[PDB]
């Protein structure tokens, strides 16, 4: 094969910072089929590939200008000179001249900003639903980065243990924040069993974690 | 402009069949090679098989862990690159990409999803979450819950509400299906004036879904 090690594997730096990522060829192969002619890529979430930098060094049609790739012998680096705010995405080597192709680890990048105190919200089990035979509640997080998150479910003051799921969007290409949305999944008996639902968020934004409720029955 | 649009992607169950197509434009398709490229969340990316030009008497070439099961053929004629993929397993999984090669760099499709499963389509029940009673502005949604394969997409007001509306990506449950959440933040001088609706669509089930969120 034709593997290639990606580093880092993930990053933050705040709008307008260097960032060097490096792409370290197999050298089992810089002897087999000479060294190689690596190409650059990044991709957003749910798109295709965009090509930035092609034979190592050449900036593709179109590609802005902060965008560099260097590389001698088998240490290849890919340069930003300033990040920008539409620069969050996954970078990745390429090589596509001796098979099998290969591709690097990736990285992840992510923008910097100040830190963004969540808003709360916290969402009853639909009528129409419960009529199915099962109830879980939402409870929502909006805007925010620091996305180390923490939020617990209580029922009257009982910490649940795992009976809920977050989901976290990508970061928003607005003002660099992020949201989530834990789920707690539960019979609809236990729901009518309690009365109490709340989800305490703790949160570095945050002084005092901040508890959202709301009792079954208006 | 080069474009490369892939079909042909879906659910199959494990042992069956597909051949995903991709239409080229752009370009003078005789002359450059073509390649699939595939994607899975947890393995990342992997080249798949590659096809040279007539001159070289269409010689194809595979990644070790599809021979003998994917077949890539070109269609000059049509401009089209097709992916004959049989006996499906696991790790075929993923978005497919349709690649061409003009040696110096290569350009990349939208790509097609390809999900191997046991499960047949499921169609998605879509609840509400209404609005509370943080001061000003509040916050409502639609929960999409119980449904089979990815993906859904989802609106409001038939795309006329687009700003500070957060669709949250899908979460396997317990269950092997996927749920979604979708929500929006507005002022709250308007929840008993505006109408908000989220149209939900899941087009590998057909459930085109519109259900407007009143507050309780």
């Known amino acids: 094969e034709l593997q290639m090690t990606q580093s880092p594997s993930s990053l933050s730096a705040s709008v307008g910072d260097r960032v060097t990522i490096t792409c370290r060829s197999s050298q089992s192969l810089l002897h087999t089929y000479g060294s190689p002619y690596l190409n650059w890529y990044l991709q957003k979430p749910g798109q295709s590939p965009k090509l930035l930098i092609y034979?190592?060094?050449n900036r593709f049609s179109g590609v802005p200008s902060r965008f560099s790739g260097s590389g001698s012998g088998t240490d290849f680096t890919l340069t930003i000179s300033s990040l920008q705010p539409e620069d969050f995405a996954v970078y990745f080597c390429?090589?596509?001249?001796?098979?099998?192709?290969?591709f690097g680890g990736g990285t992840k990048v992510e923008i910097k900003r100040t830190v963004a105190a969540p808003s709360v919200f916290i969402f009853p089990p639909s009528d129409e639903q419960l009529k199915s035979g099962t109830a879980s509640v939402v409870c929502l997080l909006n805007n925010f980065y620091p996305r180390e998150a923490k939020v617990q479910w209580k029922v009257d003051n009982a910490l649940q243990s795992g009976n809920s799921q977050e989901s976290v969007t990508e970061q928003d290409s607005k003002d660099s924040t992020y949201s989530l949305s834990s789920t707690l999944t539960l019979s609809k008996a236990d729901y009518e069993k309690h009365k109490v639902y709340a989800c305490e968020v703790t949160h570095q934004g945050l002084s005092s974690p901040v508890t959202k409720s709301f009792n079954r029955g208006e | 402009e080069v474009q490369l649009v892939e079909s042909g992607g879906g659910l199959v169950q494990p042992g069956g069949s597909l051949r995903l197509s991709c239409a080229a434009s752009?370009?003078?398709?005789?002359?450059?090679?073509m390649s699939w490229v595939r994607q899975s969340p947890e393995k990342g990316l992997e080249w798949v098989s590659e096809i040279r030009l007539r001159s070289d008497n269409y010689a194809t070439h595979y990644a070790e862990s599809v021979k003998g099961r994917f077949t890539i053929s070109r269609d000059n004629s049509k401009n089209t690159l097709y992916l004959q993929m049989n006996s499906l397993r696991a790790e075929d999984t993923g978005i497919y990409y349709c690649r061409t090669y003009f040696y110096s760099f290569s350009y990349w499709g939208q790509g097609t999803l390809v999900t191997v499963s046991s499960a047949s389509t499921k169609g998605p029940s879509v609840f509400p979450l209404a609005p509370s009673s943080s001061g000003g502005t509040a916050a409502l949604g639609c929960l999409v819950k119980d449904y089979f394969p990815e993906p859904v997409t989802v609106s409001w007001n038939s795309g006329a509400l687009t700003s500070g509306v957060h669709t949250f990506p899908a979460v396997l449950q317990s269950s092997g299906l996927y749920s979604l959440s979708s929500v929006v933040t507005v002022p709250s001088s308007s929840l008993g004036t505006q109408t908000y609706i989220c149209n939900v669509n899941h087009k590998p089930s057909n459930t085109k879904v519109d259900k407007r969120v009143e507050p309780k």
């Open positions: 034979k190592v060094s």
């Open positions: 390429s090589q596509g001249t001796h098979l099998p192709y290969t």
């Open positions: 752009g370009f003078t398709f005789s002359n450059y090679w």
